[PDB]
Amino acid sequence: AEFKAGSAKKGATLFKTRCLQCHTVEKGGPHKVGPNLHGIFGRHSGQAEGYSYTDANIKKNVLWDENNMSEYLTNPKKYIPGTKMAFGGLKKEKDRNDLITYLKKATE
Ligand code: HEC
């Protein structure tokens, strides 16, 4: 809900242990069960090239920023009802700040 820059070093560890199973960050990177996240910030939802999203993620049409990403990551299924995933969220605010600090840089 209210992003504050944290530790990108801790964020990189959080990405490996909590996201990397389903996502990649690199430009041209592959889709896993979830879409490749290159260019995610400043783009509307459902637009990773070559990835087929649910109607819910497409219809949400959220312009990803650091704040709505933090709210989304707390509980994705609450933010986008209908989204399909075996992911429940990053409940700790410090974790979300660190993760997003790293992600903003890694997906640029
Ligand atoms: C697999 C069990 C997943 C984990 C762990 C995480 N995510 Fe995920 N994510 C997954 C799926 C299947 C999808 C698409 C869902 C759909 O409704 O089609 C997503 C989507 C995202 C998005 C939105 C992408 C977009 O709108 O273009 C983001 C921003 C995202 N996921 C980020 C993310 C992060 C940072 C994670 C670790 C905290 C993470 N997800 C976990 C599957 C899975």
Swiss-Prot record:
Note from the entry: Present with 7330 molecules/cell in log phase SD medium.
What note does UniProt attach to the cofactor annotation? Answer: Binds 1 heme c group covalently per subunit.
The protein's organism comes out as Saccharomyces cerevisiae (strain ATCC 204508 / S288c) (Baker's yeast)
| Amino-acid positions noted as binding heme c in the UniProt annotation, renumbered to this chain | C19, C22, H23, M85
User: What family name appears in the similarity comment?
Assistant: Belongs to the cytochrome c family.
Q: What Gene Ontology terms describe where this protein resides (cellular component)?
A: mitochondrial intermembrane space; mitochondrion
Query: What PANTHER family does this protein map onto?
Result: CYTOCHROME C (PTHR11961)
Cofactor(s) needed by this chain: heme c
Q: Which gene encodes it?
A: CYC1
Q: Which GO terms describe its biological process?
A: mitochondrial electron transport, cytochrome c to oxygen; mitochondrial electron transport, ubiquinol to cytochrome c
Keyword entries, A-Z: Electron transport, Heme, Iron, Metal-binding, Methylation, Mitochondrion, Respiratory chain, Transport
User: Where does it localize?
Assistant: Mitochondrion intermembrane space
- Can you name this protein? Cytochrome c isoform 1
Function according to Swiss-Prot or TrEMBL: Electron carrier protein. The oxidized form of the cytochrome c heme group can accept an electron from the heme group of the cytochrome c1 subunit of ubiquinol-cytochrome c oxidoreductase. Cytochrome c then transfers this electron to the dinuclear copper A center (CU(A)) of the COX2 subunit of cytochrome oxidase, the final protein carrier in the mitochondrial electron-transport chain. Isoform 1 (CYC1) is the predominant cytochrome c during aerobic/normoxic growth.
What is expression of this protein induced or repressed by? By oxygen at the level of transcription. Expression drops rapidly when the oxygen concentration falls below 0.5 uM O(2).
Principal location: mitochondrion
- Residues bearing N6,N6,N6-trimethyllysine? K77, K78
What post-translational modification information does the record give? Methylation may enhance its transport into mitochondria. Methylation occurs in fungi, plants, and some protozoa, but not in animals. The precise role of methylation at Lys-78 is unknown, but it seems to preclude pro-apoptotic activity, possibly by lowering affinity for APAF1.
Please give the Gene Ontology molecular function terms for this protein: cardiolipin binding; electron transfer activity; heme binding; metal ion binding
What domain of life?
A: Eukaryota
Q: Which positions form S-S bridges? A: none
Query: Which SUPFAM superfamilies does the record match to this protein?
Result: Cytochrome c (SSF46626)
